[PDB]
Amino acid sequence: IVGGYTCGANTVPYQVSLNSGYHFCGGSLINSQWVVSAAHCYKSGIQVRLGEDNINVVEGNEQFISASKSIVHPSYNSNTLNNDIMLIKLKSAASLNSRVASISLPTSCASAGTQCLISGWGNTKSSGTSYPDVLKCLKAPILSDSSCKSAYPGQITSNMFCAGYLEGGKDSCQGDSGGPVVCSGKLQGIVSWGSGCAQKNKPGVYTKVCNYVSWIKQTIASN
Numbered sequence: 001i002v003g004g005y006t007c008g009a010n011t012v013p014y015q016v017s018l019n020s021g022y023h024f025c026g027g028s029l030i031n032s033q034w035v036v037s038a039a040h041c042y043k044s045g046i047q048v049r050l051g052e053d054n055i056n057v058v059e060g061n062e063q064f065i066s067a068s069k070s071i072v073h074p075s076y077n078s079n080t081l082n083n084d085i086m087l088i089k090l091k092s093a094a095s096l097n098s099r100v101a102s103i104s105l106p107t108s109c110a111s112a113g114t115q116c117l118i119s120g121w122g123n124t125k126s127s128g129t130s131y132p133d134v135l136k137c138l139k140a141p142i143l144s145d146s147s148c149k150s151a152y153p154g155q156i157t158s159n160m161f162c163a164g165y166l167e168g169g170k171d172s173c174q175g176d177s178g179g180p181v182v183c184s185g186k187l188q189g190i191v192s193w194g195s196g197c198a199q200k201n202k203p204g205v206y207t208k209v210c211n212y213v214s215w216i217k218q219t220i221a222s223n
C-alpha cells in the first residue's frame with residue numbers, strides 16, 4: 001500500500017496472508033474453510049495465515065492452516081488477467097473470533113464514487129522498495145468505468161474496475177496481490193494489477209467480485 005496508514009492490529013480480521021516460506025499474496029476469509037484471492041496468486045505449498053498483523057512476529061492471535069484445495073477461475077486468462085479470482089479451501093476450519101472473521105460477499109455490484117477499504121502487506125513506495133511487516137490500509141473511491149478504460153486502453157474487461165486517485169500518491173502495490181477491496185461490508189474487489197504503483201493516471205485495477213458470487217457460492221457448496 002502506497003500513501004496509506006497502519007490499519008492497527010487485527011482491525012481487518014478478514015485479511016489473510018498467503019505464505020509459501022514468506023508472505024507472497026493477500027486474501028479474504030469468506031467463511032471458516034474458504035479464502036478468496038487472485039488467480040495470479042496461484043501456486044502450491046500455500047499456508048493460509050489468519051489473525052496476523054506483523055507477519056514477521058508471532059503476536060498470539062495467529063492461525064496457520066494449510067490449503068487442501070486451490071480452484072482458479074475456469075476462465076482465468078494470465079495474459080490479460082481477465083477473471084483474476086481463486087478460491088482456497090483450508091485443510092481444517094479456522095476458529096472464528098474477533099480477530100479471525102469472514103467478510104460478506106456482495107449481493108450487488110458497487111458503483112463509481114463508492115468509498116472502499118484496501119489493505120495489504122505490499123510495497124509502500126511508488127519509486128524503489130519498502131515492505132512493512134504490519135498491515136497497511138487505504139481509503140479509495142471506485143472510479144468511473146470510462147476513466148478506468150481511458151487510463152488503460154484495451155486492457156479493462158467488465159470483470160475489472162479501477163479504484164484510487166488519478167492524481168496518484170495512493171494505491172495498492174506488489175505484495176497486496178489477491179487482497180481485499182471492501183465497500184459497505186462487502187468484498188467487491190481483489191488486488192489484481194496496475195502500471196507501477198500510485199503513479200499519475202495509473203489507478204489500481206481490481207477483480208470485480210459481484211460478477212463471481214454465483215460461481216463462489218456454487219463452488220463452496222460443491223467442494
Ligand SMILES: CC(C)C[C@H](NC(=O)[C@@H](O)CC(=O)O)C(=O)NCCCCNC(N)=[NH2+]
Nearest residue numbers: 040172173174177192193194195196197204
Ligand atoms: C503481472 C501480474 C501477474 C502481477 C501484477 N503486475 C503488475 O501489476 C505490474 O507488473 C504491471 C505494470 O505495468 O507495472 C501485480 O503485481 N499485481 C498485484 C498488485 C498490483 C497493484 N498495482 C497498482 N495498484 N498500481
Ligand SMILES: [Ca+2]
Nearest residue numbers: 054057058059
Ligand atoms: Ca504475526
Ligand SMILES: [Cl-]
Nearest residue numbers: 102103104105
Ligand atoms: Cl451474510
Ligand SMILES: [Cl-]
Nearest residue numbers: 003004005124
Ligand atoms: Cl507508509
Ligand SMILES: [Cl-]
Nearest residue numbers: 156157158159
Ligand atoms: Cl468483457
